């Protein structure tokens, strides 16, 4: 039944890891959108008059 | 003293008080312990990986 105990630990920790990974993916998508905006602004307003 | 772990043991300059047994920093991470025979402020550091 120790193996049952480790089963409980495993499922809990794996669920926590999955939630963390999903949050990371969402935040990275947001950051990528902001980076695209920054690159467009830098190309259009620094290398030429907008 | 029945507490099992793995790491590298180094002399530590932490200032305990005569009634503690083992200190820590955060998130239930044991950092320094006191050997029953000598009563020395040791230190625990995880073995390197990557």
């Amino acid at each position: 039944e120790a193996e049952v105990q480790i089963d409980r630990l495993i499922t809990g920790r794996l669920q926590s890891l999955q939630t963390y990974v999903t949050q990371q993916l969402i935040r990275a998508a947001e950051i990528r959108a902001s980076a695209n905006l920054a690159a467009t602004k830098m190309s259009e307003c620094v290398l030429g008059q907008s | 003293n029945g507490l099992t772990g793995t790491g590298v043991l180094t002399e530590s300059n932490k200032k305990f008080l005569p009634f503690q047994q083992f200190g820590r920093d955060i998130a239930d991470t044991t950092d320094a312990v006191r050997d029953p025979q000598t009563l020395e402020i040791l230190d625990i550091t995880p073995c390197s990986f990557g």
Partner: protein, 170 residues
């Protein structure tokens, strides 16, 4: 999950391949971060340098140009910005580009836009005195270039005042 335990590893082995996808997602995130930085900063092909003598018609750019005395080769405002803002199986990977290279790109961009105008964004940079570049820019916004050539001193003075105020506010 296991923390160096054989039994936990054996029990986790029968949960299928969940960890490969987990590692693959984080690797994609890291590669995306590197691509983001590279595509937002690496905009030019060569590294430009400002001339040793700096007489830009009265405009003063000393606050933004890099200072060779500092080892970081960063400007005043960059230093202010950098100063103002502050293991159980997890690791942190260093960025592909160090800060010195980012500073070098910024300096190259600034020198190119301060000497050759907007010409360096299309082909080869062509030199142009700074006053008659601001003349072109006023012509672009809808004001005849007579205004700049008649109020150059006032324009430069109030530009310097604005940059000083922005430095103080930051």
């Amino acid at each position: 999950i296991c923390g160096d335990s054989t039994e936990c590893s054996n029990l986790l082995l029968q949960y299928g391949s969940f960890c490969t996808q987990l590692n693959r997602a984080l690797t994609g995130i890291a590669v995306e971060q590197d691509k983001n930085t590279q595509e937002v900063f690496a905009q030019v092909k060569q590294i430009y340098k400002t001339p040793p003598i700096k007489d830009f018609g009265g405009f003063n750019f000393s606050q933004i140009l890099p200072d060779p005395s500092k080892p970081s080769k960063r400007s005043f405002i960059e230093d202010l910005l950098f100063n103002k803002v502050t293991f159980n199986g997890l690791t942190v990977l260093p960025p592909l580009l160090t800060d010195e290279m980012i500073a070098q790109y910024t300096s190259a961009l600034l020198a190119g836009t301060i000497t050759s105008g907007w010409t360096f964004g299309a082909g080869a940079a062509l030199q142009i005195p700074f006053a008659m570049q601001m003349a072109y820019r006023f012509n672009g916004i809808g004001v005849t270039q007579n205004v700049l050539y008649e109020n150059q001193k006032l324009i430069a003075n109030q530009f310097n005042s604005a940059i000083g105020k922005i430095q103080d506010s930051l």
